[PDB]
């Protein structure tokens, strides 16, 4: 039945996006209840971004200096405060489109959908993973700051990411909705390096399981292995160490396919040592690591919202 | 700045999805104004699907045999008619969430977003192309019939696809919103073959342009070529013949990058003849053909809706 990088339906998040302007800097905000959340660097000019003192810069800013626009409607700002690297603008109107929602700080390797926005308007939606070095490989242009990443369970939106910046390498960094960056990055235009980008081994395994479910079976080999033997191979190829929590989380996929997790590890090992020989798996010519075990099950079982 | 398979924001389509039941068969419908559209095979049992006489089967069906459910609300069916392979159920209530919309029949090689639905509820969204053999490579499970593909321009939804079936090969077939299948397929459970799946050459070129825009430049070679010389190579590799309309449509990407279209063709030629040598382009280890020139420009310029 096929296998795609599938994002969550984005309508619940679309109705929360607004445009936030301060002076001559415009970006996106997220309007939930009577609070608008946005990157605190909305208060900065280009000259500020080289070395900003946010507390000093914010002192110069009153409620009426923040223009918040929801579609055509202008919201009245009655309060502002900085929480870590986000600003929270209190407005006089609760968003009537507020979904049920939560703020969550995800773990590296987990995935989420991004609704890329410009000027408070949605442009498109795609699925992403938090990399082990805490960057994301997104698609973001100037003006995209404030766009949000989320997951949806039934009717509840779990916001996990707010986009802040592009690194000089072209990968992306940002915060949770409490304003704490993922990773060591800071909201300053200085060179910052990400660290080694390793591969999310438990996600690769899940996708191999997905491939078996879908009939792509050529890579299944005759071998098995051990957790320590496999991790010797993982380390050599900059794969994340596989732990017993990871084996456990793969239990349902192992059960569905009748392939023991350590057998699948030995197939992955042989793929790492021998490459793919010009073949493909689920239409990809490399090992994909942006599907979690839950994504695989969710997609292969038709979970809805 | 990165490059992703990006779908359109799906909220406008979410509020049109409903569940349609007839006897013991349930699938999705699309509720626009006071009409619900769905695959006519909603009227079939398993035994029917082997060789259905739809006109005969429909005679047995009255307005009250179609149960249409919108969220929890039950819609009152006051009219039904078959148009090619879709049913149109007239209901007594206009959808209040009806967006501006159009029905369009797309050309092979064009792309669109799919909102995969089960029981009238959205599950996820992803981008797709109509393949040259008129199949799509989707992600669809039992119950997904009736899910729709669309494009969005500003505020207008252009519906282009309604999912009907999976072929024995695991690829997907369906109709436009007038009920006419893409391709030679019929809504019967008989073996049907798709034809040779060729590669959408103008889309590969666009994505190569995208790669240059994003800094991935290693594949640019010293050669140029001619349209006839290139097409000799395209035919050998099951690539669609490139025409002068295609060259024309690539004009803005050529202008942005300063790379003449025929020069990019010679780089593609060398990639087809030499492979990729274990390298990657925009994070892919094969040549991607599911981005149109408009998708590339749209993504690389931040068009919103
Ligand atoms: C609406 C957002 C504009 N904004 C800004 C920016 C924000 C406030 C004031 C100014 Cl003066 C600039 C970016 N900056 N600049 N230094 C930065 C240091 C720390 C954090 C962000 C930084 C920034 O990186 N981005 C981009 C994010 N993602 C992808 C991009 C692709 C191309 C260009 C910019 C991108 C912004 O969009
Ligand atoms: C809600 C849809 C159920 N429906 C049906 C179906 C529809 C009406 C009556 C019955 Cl009795 C079956 C499928 N059928 N069956 N013969 C078919 C011949 C022509 C057209 C469709 C056909 C069908 O292919 N699909 C699948 C579509 N896409 C992916 C699938 C993956 C797994 C299983 C089914 C899938 C349906 O979901």
Numbering used by the authors:
A (entry chain A), B (entry chain A): 1 to 305
Published text:
Proteolytic processing of the SARS-CoV-2 polyprotein is essential for viral replication and depends on the action of nsp5 (1, 2), which encodes the main protease (MPro), also referred to as 3C-like protease (3CLPro). Starting with a lead-like dihydrouracil chemotype identified in a large-library docking campaign, we improved MPro inhibition >1000-fold by engaging additional MPro subsites and using a latent electrophile to engage Cys145. Herein, we describe the discovery of uracil-based, nonpeptidic MPro inhibitors exemplified by the advanced lead molecule AVI-4516.
Last, we were able to obtain crystal structures of N1 propargyl analogs AVI-4516 and AVI-4692 bound to MPro. Although AVI-4516 was solved at 2.35 Å resolution, AVI-4692 was solved at 1.85 Å, allowing for a detailed analysis of the binding mode. Both compounds retained the same global binding mode of des-propargyl progenitor AVI-4303, with their isoquinoline moieties bound in S1 and benzotriazole substituents in S2. Of note is that C6-aryl analog AVI-4692 engages the S1′ subsite and forms an edge-face interaction with strictly conserved His41, the catalytic base in coronavirus MPro enzymes. In these experiments, MPro activity was not regained after inhibition by AVI-4516, AVI-4773, AVI-4692, or AVI-4694, confirming that the modification is irreversible and the adduct is stable over the timescale examined. Although AVI-4516 and AVI-4773 maintained potency similar to nirmatrelvir in this triple mutant, AVI-4692 and AVI-4694 exhibited enhanced potency, likely due to a combination of better permeability and improved inhibitory properties.
